Amino acid sequence: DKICLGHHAVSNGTKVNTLTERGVEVVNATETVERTNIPRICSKGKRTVDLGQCGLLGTITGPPQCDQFLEFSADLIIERREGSDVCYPGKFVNEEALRQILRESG
Amino acid sequence: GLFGAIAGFIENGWEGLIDGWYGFRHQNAQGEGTAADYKSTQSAIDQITGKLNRLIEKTNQQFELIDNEFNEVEKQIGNVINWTRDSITEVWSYNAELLVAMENQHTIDLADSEMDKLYERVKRQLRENAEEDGTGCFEIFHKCDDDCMASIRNNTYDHSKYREEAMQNRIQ
Amino acid sequence: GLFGAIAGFIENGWEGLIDGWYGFRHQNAQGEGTAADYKSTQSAIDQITGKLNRLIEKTNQQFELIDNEFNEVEKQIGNVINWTRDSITEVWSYNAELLVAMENQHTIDLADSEMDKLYERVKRQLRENAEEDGTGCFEIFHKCDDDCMASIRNNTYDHSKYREEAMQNRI
Amino acid sequence: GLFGAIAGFIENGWEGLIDGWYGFRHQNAQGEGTAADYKSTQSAIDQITGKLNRLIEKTNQQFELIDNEFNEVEKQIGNVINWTRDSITEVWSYNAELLVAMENQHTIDLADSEMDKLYERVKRQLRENAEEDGTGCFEIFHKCDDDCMASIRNNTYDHSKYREEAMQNRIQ
Amino acid sequence: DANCEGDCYHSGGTIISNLPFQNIDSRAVGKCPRYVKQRSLLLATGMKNVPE
Ligand SMILES: *[C@@H]1O[C@H](CO)[C@@H](O)[C@H](O)[C@H]1NC(C)=O
Ligand SMILES: *[C@@H]1O[C@H](CO)[C@@H](O)[C@H](O)[C@H]1NC(C)=O
Ligand SMILES: *[C@@H]1O[C@H](CO)[C@@H](O)[C@H](O)[C@H]1NC(C)=O
Ligand SMILES: *[C@@H]1O[C@H](CO)[C@@H](O)[C@H](O)[C@H]1NC(C)=O
């Protein structure tokens, strides 16, 4: 009479890397690096402001595009590529600092 | 492995055993039989779980924009930022690849230990009633029916009630 | 717990063993006894100590100020200085929690080994004059008085001077 | 942790064993002889090699010059860079010095593990024809000629052929 | 989209994931997995596979 004791295995396993070897088959592995993107701003339950054609600095001065964003209140602020802060041409001294102030302004 | 029983003297795994990770396969008068060992299999699964619960559902920190994709920031500061970010990416890329190798090396040896712990425990139950060939088997030297086999599994084997019989066949 | 012998075949620790970390507990006709083993105990302590000398009391570079609590700096350079510091704090926090987790994991297995190494030394001391109980005990098949138990402890046990009875009693 | 092999119950190494890393050294009627075991010696080498292959000569990111050795940059931006550079340099040294030790610790227990794997292999090979001395030797209880020790090495040893003679000499 | 909830935004969308590392945008903002150059780092969740 014999009694023998062993471990399980599978036909097609997954190769992994270790301290000491490349491509060593194992029973199961799972991924550690996320690659699946969601092509949308997921904004469930977040007070969101989509500035659109309004530039984030245009909320301070109020050019015609930003007439609807003079006193907004948000948790998530979105700038779009078509946003222009100005109507009469000009630019803000220290623009980005003021933008960084406004993005976390609420 | 590190304890040499996943590649050392257990030659291969048992693709049929889907009951668990580690288990018994006996042969006796009544015939063949295969069962898995819960107390061992769960000891390694509870351990991999610890690792996963440590790498997954981390609550990472909140970071803000310092760059601008639409209106590029000043050059000299844009380079200090591009430079700094590129450096941190080195660290994390290194930290990520090293951590997995550390963990994957550990898990692969960790499973060995559970095999050797099972093996070297069953052997002690059969104190002088059996001898180990060295393939992961135990040559039993007495009549071990399918109840005697299940006796071994749930650790009810009374080595004394077979000893005098076993010792006899051992020396002749 | 890679070697067994702490949660393994060894049932539980002895709270009474205050001499060292590992030890012997013998039972024979002359009575009872319990003593420590210097070799195994000191060989783990020496290791655990070596870890402490590797983390404790290590000097670091001098870092000066680039911020200001009172007269705040310009914002654009501030959010950069902050974004960098917050990014290094992640690195050193991850390095800390990981180092200690890896450190403890090796520490605990480090004590398994030294337990198991002690158990295996004794087993080959008494060669065929004793059998493996399974709970960390050795059923000696020859009368081993308190002077003989002392021989096992200090590694003066000569198995040939008892090897004769031994085998006669195992059969 | 460690295994008992290297510093433990094997007292010293063999400065005369240049054939490999691990090896046999029997003694018998016809003399003394020493030969290396290929499978274990290569098994360790295939492992340390796997470590170097991970450290030596790997793509390293291209980094550029934010600083200036001839015309020093502004003191305020320059103190941020000097600070960022020094903060990373600590990271890269914590990582390196830790990595080398974490590997050195693993490598030293690695080779230790391979010896025990050799030792406990041979034990099983001579089921009951030998007892372990405890210094890393096996007192063999039959007569083992040169083509016997060689059969022990290349794993052709049939223990059933020598067992009866062996089991007699032991118990007495 | 108000149907999904995410906390890691980049110029191309949201990253909703429990993994520690990401490989989607190095400039992603919010509560994000940290960026790695590697495309995939597989963590072992089983033993050495020794088949017949
Ligand atoms: C195997 O790993 C994959 C990785 O995604 C996981 O989804 C699956 O649940 C795992 N299966 C088992 C049986 O572990
Ligand atoms: C900084 O990197 C971004 C991409 O990450 C690039 O578009 C920009 O031109 C870079 N700025 C400088 C000054 O190199
Ligand atoms: C940087 O962080 C500190 C807290 O550590 C905060 O008080 C300070 O306002 C931050 N810097 C800026 C420019 O907001
Ligand atoms: C930065 O460090 C360099 C040496 O690496 C030194 O020459 C220079 O004076 C330092 N700059 C500042 C502003 O401390």
Helix residue ranges per DSSP H, D28-158: 38-55, 75-125, 146-153
B71 touches chain C (CB under 8 A): no
Angle at CA of residue A57, ends A56 and A63, nearest 5°: 100
Closest CA–CA distance from residue E6 to any residue of chain B (Å) = 13
Contact D80 C66 (CB under 8 A): yes
Q: How far apart are CA C113 and CA C4, in angstroms?
A: 9
Dihedral (Cα; C139, C144, C145, C151), 10-degree rounding: -110
Q: How far apart are CA B88 and CA B91, in angstroms?
A: 5
Q: How far apart are CA C147 and CA C67, in angstroms?
A: 73
B91 touches chain C (CB under 8 A): yes
- Cβ neighbours of residue C3 closer than 8 Å, sequence gap 6 or more: B113, C109, C112, C113, C115, C116, D1
Q: How far apart are CA E52 and CA E47, in angstroms?
A: 15
The domains found in chain C, sorted by start residue, are 1-171 (3.90.20.10)
Residue D159 β-bridge partners = none
Q: Which two tokens stand for residue C110?
A: 């480090």
Q: Which helix (H) or strand (E) holds B33?
A: strand B32-36
Is residue B55 classed exposed, middle or buried when 0-12, 13-18 and 19+ CB atoms within 10 A define those classes? middle
Closest CA–CA distance from residue E19 to any residue of chain B (Å) = 5
Q: How far apart are CA B88 and CA D92, in angstroms?
A: 11
> CB-hemisphere CA count at 13 Å for C8?
26
Q: How far apart are CA D119 and CA A32, in angstroms?
A: 39
- Among A7, A18, A83, beta carbon nearest to B108: A18
Amino acid at C163: R
Q: Name the one residue in this structure whose structure tokens are 């400065």.
A: D15
Q: How far apart are CA A80 and CA C42, in angstroms?
A: 67
Q: How far apart are CA C52 and CA C56, in angstroms?
A: 6
- 3-class secondary-structure state, position E36: coil
Neighbours of B51 (CB within 10 A): 18
Amino acid at D64: E
CB D1 within 8 A of CB D108: no
Long-range Cβ contact pairs of C56-62 (< 8 A, separation 24 or more): C60/D90, C61/D86, C61/D89, C61/D90
Give the chain B residue whose CA is nearest to the CA of C116: B117
Closest CA–CA distance from residue B72 to any residue of chain C (Å) = 13
CA of B90 to the centre of ligand 1 (A): 30
Pocket test for ligand 4, best of D82, D83, D89 (most atoms within 8 A of CB): D82
CB A83 within 8 A of CB A51: yes
Q: Does ligand 2 lie within 6 Å of residue B89's CB atom?
A: no
D54 touches chain B (CB under 8 A): yes
Q: How far apart are CA C13 and CA C11, in angstroms?
A: 7
Neighbours of C119 (CB within 10 A): 20
In C4-29, which positions are buried (b, 16+ CB within 10 angstroms) versus exposed (e)?
A: bbbebbbeeeeeebeebbbbbebeee
- Cβ neighbours of residue D67 closer than 8 Å, sequence gap 6 or more: D73, D78, D81, D85
Contact B118 A5 (CB under 8 A): yes
Dihedral (Cα; D12, D15, D21, D24), 10-degree rounding: -70
Angle at CA of residue E35, ends E32 and E40, nearest 5°: 115
Q: How far apart are CA B148 and CA D72, in angstroms?
A: 85
Q: How far apart are CA E39 and CA C61, in angstroms?
A: 35
Q: Does ligand 1 lie within 6 Å of residue A17's CB atom?
A: no
CA of B67 to the centre of ligand 2 (A): 9
Amino acid at B166: A
Residue length, chain C?
Answer: 171
Q: How far apart are CA E45 and CA A29, in angstroms?
A: 5
Helix residue ranges per DSSP H, A1-106: 58-61, 95-103
In B130-145, which positions are buried (b, 16+ CB within 10 angstroms) versus exposed (e)?
A: bbbebebbbebbbebe
Q: Subunits touching E (CB < 8 Å, at least 3 pairs)?
A: A, B
Q: Which two tokens stand for residue D110?
A: 């690695």
Q: Which two tokens stand for residue B159?
A: 């080595």
Residue A24 β-bridge partners = A16
Q: Name the one residue in this structure whose structure tokens are 């402001």.
A: A49
> CB-hemisphere CA count at 13 Å for B159?
14
For D159, phi then psi, to 5°, come to -70, -20
Q: Which two tokens stand for residue E32?
A: 């994000």
- Bridge-based pairing of strands D31-36 and D23-28 is antiparallel
Longest CA–CA span in chain A (Å) reads: 97
Closest CA–CA distance from residue D143 to any residue of chain B (Å) = 19
Q: How far is CA B61 from CA A101, C69, C91, in A?
A: 19, 23, 11
CA of B115 to the centre of ligand 1 (A): 22
Q: Please report the sign of the dihedral spanned by the C-alpha atoms of residue B50, residue B52, residue B57, residue B61.
A: positive
Q: How far apart are CA B85 and CA B77, in angstroms?
A: 12
Using a CB-CB cut-off of 8 Å, the residues of chain A touching D53 are: 22
Q: Which helix (H) or strand (E) holds B121?
A: helix B75-122
**Experimental technique behind these coordinates:** X-ray
Using a CB-CB cut-off of 8 Å, the residues of chain D touching C127 are: 131-132, 134
Q: How many helices (H) and strands (E) does chain E have?
A: 0, 6
CA of C56 to the centre of ligand 4 (A): 30
- Cβ neighbours of residue B54 closer than 8 Å, sequence gap 6 or more: C101
Best of B45, B49, B107, B117 to substitute, by most chain E Cβ atoms within 10 angstroms, is: B107
For C9, phi then psi, to 5°, come to -60, -25
CB pairs under 8 A between B and E: 91
Using a CB-CB cut-off of 8 Å, the residues of chain E touching B65 are: 27, 29
Residue D139 β-bridge partners = D131
Q: Which two tokens stand for residue D15?
A: 């400065």
Comparing CA positions, the residue from B139, B146, B122, B154 lying closest to residue B32 is B146
Give the residue whose CA is nearest to atom 5 of ligand 3: C82
Q: How far apart are CA C121 and CA C22, in angstroms?
A: 13
| Beta strands in A19-68, from DSSP E residues, in sequence order | 22-26, 29-31, 33-34, 48-50
Using a CB-CB cut-off of 8 Å, the residues of chain E touching A33 are: 19, 21-23, 36, 38-41
Q: How far is CA D50 from CA A47, B35, C103, D56, in A?
A: 53, 37, 23, 11
- Cα C163 → chain centroid: 33
Q: How far apart are CA A79 and CA E13, in angstroms?
A: 13
Q: How far apart are CA E9 and CA B69, in angstroms?
A: 13
Q: Subunits touching C (CB < 8 Å, at least 3 pairs)?
A: A, B, D
Q: How far is CA B113 from CA B43, B127, C116, in A?
A: 11, 21, 13
B69 touches chain C (CB under 8 A): no
Q: Please give, one letter per residue, the 3-state secondary structure of chain C.
A: CCCCCCCCCCCCCCCCCCCCCCEEEEEECCEEEEEECHHHHHHHHHHHHHHHHHHCCCCCCCCCCCCCCCCCCCHHHHHHHHHHHHHHHHHHHHHHHHHHHHHHHHHHHHHHHHHHHHHHHHHHHCCCCEEECCCCCEEECCCCCHHHHHHHHCCCCCHHHCHHHHHHHHC
Give the chain A residue whose CA is nearest to the CA of E34: A33
- 3-class secondary-structure state, position B107: helix
CB C2 within 8 A of CB C112: yes
Using a CB-CB cut-off of 8 Å, the residues of chain A touching B17 are: 6-8
Q: Which helix (H) or strand (E) holds B53?
A: helix B38-55
Q: Which two tokens stand for residue B171?
A: 């020396």
Dihedral (Cα; D15, D19, D23, D24), 10-degree rounding: -90
Closest CA–CA distance from residue A97 to any residue of chain C (Å) = 5
- Cα B88 → chain centroid: 34
Contact E45 B48 (CB under 8 A): yes
Comparing CA positions, the residue from B108, B115, B101 lying closest to residue B1 is B108
- 3-class secondary-structure state, position E27: coil
Give the chain A residue whose CA is nearest to the CA of E32: A34
CB C24 within 8 A of CB C152: yes
Q: How close are the terminal C-alpha atoms of chain B, in Å?
A: 38
DSSP 8-state secondary structure symbol assigned to residue B60: P
Pocket test for ligand 2, best of B65, B69, B72, B87 (most atoms within 8 A of CB): B72
Q: Which two tokens stand for residue B153?
A: 């599994």
Q: How far apart are CA B87 and CA B70, in angstroms?
A: 24
For E44, phi then psi, to 5°, come to -75, 130
Contact B6 A7 (CB under 8 A): yes
